[PDB]
């Protein structure tokens, strides 16, 4: 049959790459992925955080963050 | 015929499904893989959304992960 | 003492029957239950989805859905 | 006397309790059984709700399951 | 190194004491803690519930409640 | 150098971090301990909040527990 791509294997392939993470509650990040665990907690470097003010606006740059996997909506490998 | 939810998803592997997330985001896409949390990997994705003006396509995406913590409902072949 | 009815045993008794599921976020379904797991993920056939537009309005019919147990608010055996 | 939350619920089996869910739904009902997730089965249920016009009874229900993912607070004999 | 204070050890130290619990969704309680588990479910006695009507208003007194750990935002040992 | 999220937090023990919770509460504080759920104990805390008038300090607190179910993001030395 097809190739099966498990979720945690997809994320694993993302390490070293700039990814885009959409978090619940209208906050979005672009960052390079350094690690993750089974809960889909992630460590991003070189981050840009985007929000939505009155469309998509950058609201911050940061060196390093942790994003909580309990708060992730969607991840986009390749980063946009 | 008792159908386990995971066995329903498993049958959809390589097919298009329709996924209604929490927060009125909806995604049509080809299911590539999944886990017991209903974390899913979708390809060939159209993102729908809701705009004051019905349901509008607001995006096209390739390989994503949708967080199972954030899924509401899944329509096999929707 | 009384009869104890465990939650997963209640759902088990629902198999084959039309149930009513209230999901978080003002979406409601009536469907025949075909399976479920320990997370309260469910497979419904013959479904009517109701929402709330400006009271309770039917918004869709579907053949088969999966409802995520992480998003369930309440289940009503017998279906209304 | 340390009281484990589950041992508090266990004592309520066969009695009326008051359950405040997430999202301003509230339920008075007779507790029939439960699990460690605070999934609960309630009988003889009155559903309260909030309406612009206080707390209004918006429904009467028989045997339900209330999802523990969605519970905020539980009042023994409320 | 420093003293490490694990979350469940902090709560353990609170038993017998009046604590303040902020729950998600703008509801707050002050109560004496009688028990808790690994999910951060808690049993409070002698409770005051505060809400926010049009600032912080007391909305109820209760003898005993259970607060669901899935709905806790923050706990404050010492109680304000 | 693969960095596990828990190993990132572990390095912050005894240092100030910045924690963005769900619901637009934000907390600067000294990390005292944590668990795999990202439950955390913070000291010497300033609570920020959002007020129609930017980001306003709305409180000062001592030893709290922040619920990991309710964390969005964590900035080491923010």
DSSP letter for C26, please: T
Whether A and D touch, i.e. at least 3 CB pairs below 8 A, reads as: no
Instruction: Decide if A70 touches F, using CB distance below 8 A.
Output: yes
CA angle centred on D9, ends D3 and D15, rounded to 5° = 130
Residues 6+ apart with CB under 8 A from F52: none
Nearest to E65 by CA among E80, E52, E51, E46: E46
What's the rounded Cα separation, in Å, for the pair B73 and A21? 21
Sign of CA dihedral A13, A17, A20, A21: positive
Measured between CA atoms, the residue of chain F closest to residue E78 is F63
Q: Are D42 and D13 in contact, with CB atoms under 8 Å apart?
A: no
CB D2 within 8 A of CB E35: yes
Q: How many Cα atoms within 13 Å fall on the side-chain side of residue C71? A: 25
Taking CA atoms, what residue in E is nearest to D3? E35
- How many CB atoms neighbour CB E55 within 10 A? 6
Taking the mean position of all CA atoms in its chain, how far away is CA B56?
A: 16
Tokens linked to A54: 């009155």
E6 → chain F, closest CA residue: F33
Q: Choosing among A52, A71, A74, which should be mutated to test the B contact, i.e. which has the most B CBs within 10 A?
A: A74
Determine the 3-state secondary structure of D37 from DSSP.
Answer: coil
Find out whether D50 and D70 touch, Cβ atoms under 8 Å.
Answer: no
DSSP state of A2: P
The number of angstroms, rounded, from the C-alpha of C23 to the middle of its chain's C-alpha atoms is 8
Question: How far, in Å, CA of D78 to CA of F71, rounded?
Answer: 32
SS3 state at C55: coil
Q: How far apart are CA A32 and CA A34, in angstroms?
A: 7
Residue B53 near chain C (CB below 8 Å): no
Mutate to test the interface with C, among B17, B27, B72, B76 (most CBs of C within 10 A): B72
Nearest residue, CB atoms, C35 vs list B2, B36, B72: B2
Query: Shortest Cα distance from D76 to chain E (angstroms)?
Result: 7
- Asked if E68 is an interface residue toward chain D (Cβ–Cβ < 8 A), one would say yes
Q: Which partners does chain D have (≥3 C-beta pairs < 8 Å)?
A: C, E
Q: Burial of C25 by CB count in 10 Å (0-12 exposed, 13-18 middle, 19+ buried)?
A: middle
- Angle at CA of residue C52, ends B51 and C57, nearest 5°: 115
* Alpha carbon of residue D64 to chain centroid: 10
DSSP-derived secondary structure letter, A77: T
Cα B23 to Cα A71, A74, B20, C61, E64, distances in angstroms: 13, 12, 9, 21, 34
Joined together, the tokens standing for residue F64 give: 């709290």
Distance CA E70, CA F68 (A): 9
Q: How far is B60 from chain C (nearest CA, A)?
A: 24
* Assigned token pair, E44: 């409070």
Report whether C59 contacts C70 (CB < 8 A).
no
Nearest CA in chain E to D78: E62
Residue B62 near residue B42 (C-beta atoms within 8 A): no
Q: Which residues of chain B neighbour C39 with C-beta distances below 8 Å? A: 36
DSSP-assigned letters across all residues of D5-69: HHHHHHHHTTSEEEEEETTS-EEEEEEEEE-TT--EEEEEEEEEEE----EEEEEEESSEEE-GG
What are B73's two structure tokens? Answer: 């409902």
A50 within 8 A of A21, measured Cβ to Cβ = no
Residue located via tokens 């000062």: F60
Among partner residues F6, F22, F76, which is closest to A64 by beta-carbon distance?
Answer: F76
Question: How far apart (Å, rounded) are the C-alpha atoms in residues F26 and A9?
Answer: 32
Cβ neighbours of residue B43 under 8 Å, at least 6 residues apart?
A: B29, B30, B32, B62, B63
> Cβ–Cβ of F64/E78 closer than 8 Å?
no
Whether residue A43 and residue F8 make contact (CB cut-off 8 A), yes or no, is: yes
Distances (CA, A) of C57 to C26, C28, C41, D24: 11, 10, 24, 21
Q: What structural domains does chain F harbor?
A: 1-78 (2.30.30.100)
| β-strand partners of E67 | D73, E42
DSSP calls for A4-50: P--HHHHHHTTTTSEEEEEETTTEEEEEEEEEE-TT--EEEEEEEEE
CA angle E2, E7, E11 (to 5 degrees): 115
Considering only CA atoms, give the Rg of chain F: 12
Q: Which residues contact D52 (CB under 8 A, 6 or more apart)?
A: none
Query: Which burial class, exposed, middle or buried, applies to D52 when counting CB atoms under 10 A from its CB (0-12, 13-18, 19+)?
Result: exposed
Q: What is the residue whose two structure tokens read 């913070």?
A: F42
Triad D35, D36, D38: Cα angle to 5°? 70
Q: Report d(CA B39, CA F56) in Å as an integer.
A: 37
C42-73 burial, b if ≥16 CB within 10 A, otherwise e? bbbeebbbbeeeeeeeeeeebebbbbbbbbbb
Backbone angles phi, psi at A69, to 5 degrees: -70, -20
d(C-alpha F64, C-alpha A12), whole Å: 34
Phi, psi values for residue E12, rounded to 5°: -50, -45
Length of chain A: 80
Give the helix/strand (H/E) hosting B12. Answer: helix B5-12
Write out the two tokens for B24: 């009125």
CA distance C17 to B53: 40
> C64 in contact with B at a CB cutoff of 8 Å?
yes
Report DSSP letters for E7-59, one per residue. HHHHHHTTTTSEEEEEETTTEEEEEEEEEE-TT--EEEEEEEEEEE---EEEE
Q: Are D38 and D21 in contact (CB under 8 A)?
A: no
- Check CB contact under 8 Å for B14 and A7: no
Q: How close, in Å, is residue F21 to chain E by CA atoms?
A: 8
Sole residue written with tokens 């508090």: D8
Decide if F25 and E73 are in contact by the 8 Å CB cutoff.
yes
Q: Does F19 touch chain E (CB under 8 A)?
A: no
What Å resolution does this PDB entry report?
2.1
Cα E44 from Cα E14, distance rounded (Å)? 11
Report the alpha-carbon distance of residue B43 to residue B59 in Å, rounded. 13
Cβ of residue B69 closer than 8 Å to a chain A Cβ: yes
Q: How far apart are CA E48 and CA A40, in angstroms?
A: 37
Q: Establish if C9 touches chain D: CB-CB under 8 angstroms.
A: yes
Tokens of C40: 């309260």
A54 touches chain B (CB under 8 A): no
Q: What does the alpha-carbon distance between residue C57 and residue C64 come to, in Å, rounded to a whole number?
A: 20
How far is C-alpha A9 from the chain's CA centre?
15
The single-letter DSSP state of residue B68 is G
């Amino acid at each position: 049959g097809g190739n099966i791509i498990l979720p945690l294997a997809l994320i694993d392939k993302c390490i070293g790459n700039r990814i885009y993470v959409v978090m619940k509650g209208d906050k979005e990040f672009s960052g390079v992925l350094r690690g993750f665990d089974e809960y889909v907690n992630m460590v991003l470097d070189d981050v840009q955080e985007y929000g939505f003010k009155a469309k998509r606006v950058m609201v911050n740059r940061l060196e390093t963050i942790l994003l909580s996997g309990n708060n992730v909506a969607m991840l986009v490998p390749g980063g946009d």
